[PDB]
Structures are given as C-alpha cells and as structure tokens.
Amino acid sequence: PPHGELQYLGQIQHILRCGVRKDDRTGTGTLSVFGMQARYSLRDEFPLLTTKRVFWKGVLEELLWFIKGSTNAKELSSKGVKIWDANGSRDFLDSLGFSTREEGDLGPVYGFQWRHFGAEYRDMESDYSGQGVDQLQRVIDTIKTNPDDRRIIMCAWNPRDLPLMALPPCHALCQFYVVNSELSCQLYQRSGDMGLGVPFNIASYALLTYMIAHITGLKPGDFIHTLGDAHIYLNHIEPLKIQLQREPRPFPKLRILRKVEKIDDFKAEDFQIEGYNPHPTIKME
Amino acid sequence: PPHGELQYLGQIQHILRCGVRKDDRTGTGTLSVFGMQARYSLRDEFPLLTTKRVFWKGVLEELLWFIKGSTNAKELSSKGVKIWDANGSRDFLDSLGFSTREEGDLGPVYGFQWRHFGAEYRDMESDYSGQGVDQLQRVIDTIKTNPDDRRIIMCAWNPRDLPLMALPPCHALCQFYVVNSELSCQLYQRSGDMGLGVPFNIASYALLTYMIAHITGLKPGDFIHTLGDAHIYLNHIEPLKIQLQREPRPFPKLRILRKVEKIDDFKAEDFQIEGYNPHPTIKMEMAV
Ligand SMILES: O=c1ccn([C@H]2C[C@H](O)[C@@H](COP(=O)(O)O)O2)c(=O)[nH]1
Ligand SMILES: O=c1ccn([C@H]2C[C@H](O)[C@@H](COP(=O)(O)O)O2)c(=O)[nH]1
C-alpha cells in the first residue's frame, strides 16, 4: 500500500506507461497526463526525496523569500540560490516588453500575491505595507480562531496581474485543513516537471505546512499534491528510469530549533534536516 | 470498463469508513476527508449521476447565468431555479452586514469573476463592459490558438472581493488541457457536500467542458474532479446508505442541437440529455 516516496515514483511510472506525447512552448516534447494526486504523510517524517538529492537549501531560502514578500530575484540570489535569476535578467525582462524595469524585478509574483493580493504593483522596491490582502497572515489567523473553516486558501493566481509577472505561477493555490490537532495542506500545481520541479515543489509546501503548524501549535498532518499537466520531458526518461530502480531510504526528519511566534520571524538557521541519506544527484536538462 | 459513477460512490464509502468527525458553522457535523480526486470520461457519455436524479435544469440554467456574467439571484430565479435565492434575500444580506444592498445582489460572485476579474464591483446592475479580465473568453481563445498551453485557467477565487460576496466560491478554479483534439477540464473544489452538492457540481463542469469543446471544435476528453474538504453531513448518512445500494445505469449522452459560434450564444434549448435513466430523487436536508 504505497506511501511516501513510492507515491512520487508511482506517478513517474504512470506517466511513462500512460502519458501521451505532447509538445510544450520550448518544443522539447513531453509525455503528459492531466490530473494526478498524491498524499505525503508529514507525521514524524519530512518528504525530502531520497532516490535523488533535492536542493534543500534552494527550497528553504526560496520559501523564506516568498514569506518576506520579495519579488526581487537579487534578494534570493544573494543567499546563493540562483533559480529565479534568468527570469529577472535584463534580456528576459526586455523580451517581455519591460525595458524600463530594473534587473531582478520579477513583477507581482509569489511574494507579492501572498502578502499583498490586489494591491497595485509598482516595482520590487516599493513599500506595500498595509496594501492588498495579506493571505498568509489571514490563513494563520483563521487556523487559530476557526480551525474548521473550509476556506483557508492562499492563492497566487491573479488574472489581473499575470501580464506583469516574469512567469505565471505554477502553484496556483493552496488550501489548509485542520482536524484532530493536525494541519494538512493541498497544493493545486497547474504544471509539473516531474523530473526536475516536482521533488523541489513537494518539499516547499511540506516546509510551509511545518512552519504554519509550528506557529499555530498544531501537528503536521498530510501534504496533498494535486497536478494539472503532470509531465516528463523526453530527455528525462532515461535518467528517471535509472532513478526508478533505486530503493528509497527512510525520509529524514525536519527539526525546528527554537520556538517561533510569527511567520515573519523564521530564519534559515532555525531549521535542521535530520538523517537525510539520498542516493546521488541525477542530472536532468 | 467500470461505470464512471462508481468513483463517486467509492468516495462516499471512503468517507463513511475513514472520514473523521468535523464540525461546521451550522453545528450539524460532518464526516470529512481532505484531498480526493476522481476522473469522469466525457467521451460519448455525460456523467449525470444515475443513483439519484440530479437537478439538470438547475445545472444548465445556473451555468448559462454564470456565462452571462450575472450576479443577480433574481435573474436565475426567473428561470425557475431557486438555488441562490436564500443567499440574495434581504434577511441573508442583512445577516452579512449588507443592509444597503438591493435584494438579489450576491456581490462579485462567479459571473463577475469569470467575465470581469479585477474590476471594481459596484452593484449587480452596473455595466462592466470592457472592465477586468474576461477569463472565460481568454480560455476559449487560448484553446484555439495555443492548445498546448499549460496556463489555461479560469479562477473564481478573488481574495480582494471575498468580503463583498454573499458566499465564498466552492469552485475556486478550473484548468483546461488539450491533447489529441480532446479537451479536458480539472476543477479544484475547496469544499464538497458529497450528498447534496457534488453530483450537481460534476454535471456543471462537465457541461462547461462540452460547451467549450463545441465552441473550439474539439471533442470532450476527461473531467477531473479534485476536492479539498470532502464531507458528508451526519443527517445525510442514512439516505446515502440507501443510495449506495443502487446499481448505476449507463450514463446519458448530451446533444448540442445546433452549431454555436460564441459561448454567449448558447441557449437552454440548445441542449438535450438523451437516455437519462436515474433511480428516484433522494431527499437530503441542506445544512442551514
Ligand atoms: O515550481 C515550478 C516551476 C516550473 N515547473 C515546470 C513545469 C513546466 O515544465 C515549466 C513551466 O512551464 P509552463 O507550465 O509555464 O509552460 O516548469 C515546475 O515543475 N515547478
Ligand atoms: O457548489 C457548491 C456550493 C456549496 N457546497 C457545499 C459544501 C459545504 O458543505 C457548503 C458550503 O460551505 P463552506 O464550505 O463555505 O463552509 O455547501 C457544494 O458542495 N457545492
């Protein structure tokens, strides 16, 4: 009765067996399935994949960067995490018509949507204090005062702001749920590169759930990963096949090293991944 | 090939067996599971549930009402479909603090969000032409010009407008997908009353997919139903146990009776459900 990492590997196998050939904007080509769902227990385990090493430092720094409301790729890059740098480049920005935008200015992406949904975006340096909807703090407040609420949603998909963004968000929304003192999170991810993006994305939302569980005095329950276009790039098939034959090691644990009161107060040094024993990195695309 | 409706019935059985007690605002109580997903083929079949009769006229008129951009419960009620009337009443509006709102004015709900996302909501009578994002038409245009696009989303969840709405939307967003000339749709439904709401909601989004497939010259593929809080109200347990004893009948077909060019041009008489053979209606009392 597959659990943990086997859910992810079962998804890869399903796409290899049942996915259909489908081109993408890059003309690379994929095998693709529309609509998948996996459940990862968070109960005394943290779903950082072991069949290939996941970029944990990237996961953690990106999430803290989102939490601070930043839309400046330079602020993430300064932490040694370069994953958004190409989308903030001078050439890239110009290709989108944003010639007067300063380098690094991703537009109203995750950070802005999460803390200031509906505010008027100006640039990455503007003071947005008190503007728009602080969905992250509202989620936290609702969990505290009305844990049964069926509307605990944080939504990054903002149709009005899409044309200003460097890239449209893949993580369109997430929803939280509480029962029996456990906090669960479901992510709606519209588009998933199973080889390169998805392991990172699972660890991101499991981490967010651990953070909010910590702040609200609850235990982490499940992370439910829902995909729209779940795809494997054709040039990832052979590497993933090698990966698929590797035995998972038990998932590590995540420790939070002090009592933290407010979501904005977490720092990277507050977190420790314990007993992570991955098989070596597998290079993909 | 098992009947598609067995997925819905398997979800009910799972919640009865493994759902946990979870209270709601009405103090009715539910059994609840978080995170479920079912896939309903749309290929030469229409998933209108047969183990109890679904209110098809409600499904179809509500959808046409969303398409027109309406936020006026009276405009749906005039078609004989009363499902939003309690939420537009003077009493319900006043309970939310909207004492100066006109009766019927649901606020910036589905219709507004789908056709005018991001516009400033005034009232249900205002002219919003050209204001906000027409997500419904943009979805149609993208399917036509770039069917591989992985961003074909229509989103009703608008955090800025939530406090103005009569009810926050259960159907937070949907996404479309095209491959092999087939159009699929996935619904993210944050909250599902499995007894009373879900059968209706499946028919709504399958109907929307048939409509857009027709407009864009594609065949309907799959409807993927994803749930957040999937729940059975405690007072629905005994009726659902009766329902669970029924064998599904083969699903009907949906016929579209003329060639329609624009989503706004569909009329109720354009649609015919063929070979629907449900078991009788099962009464389930709505929470509050
Ligand atoms: O966090 C992320 C960001 C991007 N992608 C993937 C999916 C696609 O392969 C590509 C995004 O391209 P589009 O879906 O926007 O076309 O990157 C992910 O898996 N996770
Ligand atoms: O289209 C709809 C509208 C509502 N409901 C249900 C789910 C809940 O039982 C209730 C709405 O309550 P909240 O989720 O907002 O608490 O009605 C549905 O299943 N489908």
From Swiss-Prot, chain A:
Effect listed in the UniProt record for changing residue 135 to H: In DKCD; uncertain significance
InterPro entries hit by this protein: Thymidate_synth/dCMP_Mease, Thymidate_synth/dCMP_Mease_dom, Thymidate_synth/dCMP_Mease_sf, Thymidylate_synthase, Thymidylate_synthase_AS
Effect of residue 62 to K: In DKCD; uncertain significance
Catalytic function, reaction form: dUMP + (6R)-5,10-methylene-5,6,7,8-tetrahydrofolate = 7,8-dihydrofolate + dTMP
Localization per Swiss-Prot or TrEMBL: Nucleus; Cytoplasm; Mitochondrion; Mitochondrion matrix
Binding site for dUMP: 25, 150-151, 170-171, 190-193, 201, 231-233
Alphabetically ordered keywords of this record: Cytoplasm, Disease variant, Dyskeratosis congenita, Isopeptide bond, Membrane, Methyltransferase, Mitochondrion, Mitochondrion inner membrane, Nucleotide biosynthesis, Nucleus, Phosphoprotein, Transferase, Ubl conjugation
A GO biological process held by the record: dTTP biosynthetic process
Keyword Mitochondrion: yes
PTM annotation (Phosphoserine): residues: 89
Pathway: Pyrimidine metabolism; dTTP biosynthesis
Ranges in a coiled coil: none
GO molecular function: folic acid binding; mRNA regulatory element binding translation repressor activity; sequence-specific mRNA binding; thymidylate synthase activity
Known partners and oligomeric status: Homodimer.
NCBIfam families: PRK01827.1-3 (NF002497), thym_sym (TIGR03284)
Similarity remark: Belongs to the thymidylate synthase family.
Protein name: Thymidylate synthase
